[PDB]
């Protein structure tokens, strides 16, 4: 039931992607929306461990989302879950890991919807 | 299965917490250790602002933490969850709201352990 940081979202909301790095690797976080073959959104890798990198506010179109995380030219192996708050409050988590490192810890990103 | 806030985490580790605000008004979150008199940790939004206030890094103390979010002179209404990414990366999630109608998503607070 982990699965590889894919969602799907309700159509044409707004929603927020938060990303925090434990690992100082210099990772790329890709958002992607749908089919689109360029990513919607990128982070930037973090300057220091256990860094919130901020929040980024993007519309999920046809409702397909999918973060994808690079590290040192290799994605890095991701598990992610929903879990919701009274089906009021929707979340997707993904833990991503860049070794070697087994823990799923290595960097986070936080999704959540829909906003306000 | 959502609490109110409150979370039982390995005693004396460290542990990440983010606080995400997007509420009309002034919120203030503290997050409290096991009976200690003081919050551990306070984030303050400023209303009509969407913002990401940080993550800050924690002692889970003995392991007791709970999260409160005042909102408008009175506590928000929570809803929490826990959930794990392979039994090796945990997280907390709490929403909040003012509203007693509305989306726990005035506040949005996340809880991460272990760290590395």
Redesign the interface.
């Given at each position: 039931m982990?699965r590889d940081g894919t969602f799907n979202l309700p159509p044409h909301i707004k929603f927020?992607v938060?990303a925090?790095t434990?690992?100082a690797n210099d990772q790329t976080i890709d958002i992607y929306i749908d089919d689109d073959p360029k990513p919607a959104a990128t982070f930037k890798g973090a300057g220091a461990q256990?860094?919130?990198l901020?929040?980024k506010?993007l519309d999920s179109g046809n409702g397909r989302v999918r973060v994808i995380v690079m590290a040192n030219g290799r994605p890095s192996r991701l598990?992610?879950?929903q879990?919701?708050?009274?089906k009021?409050?929707y979340?997707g988590?993904?833990?991503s890991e860049d070794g070697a490192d087994?823990?799923?810890?290595?960097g986070?990103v936080?999704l959540?919807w829909?906003?306000?």
């Open positions: 982990e927020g938060t925090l434990h690992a256990d860094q919130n901020g929040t506010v598990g992610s879950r879990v919701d708050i009274f009021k409050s979340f988590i993904i833990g087994d823990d799923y810890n290595d986070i936080f959540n829909p906003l306000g």
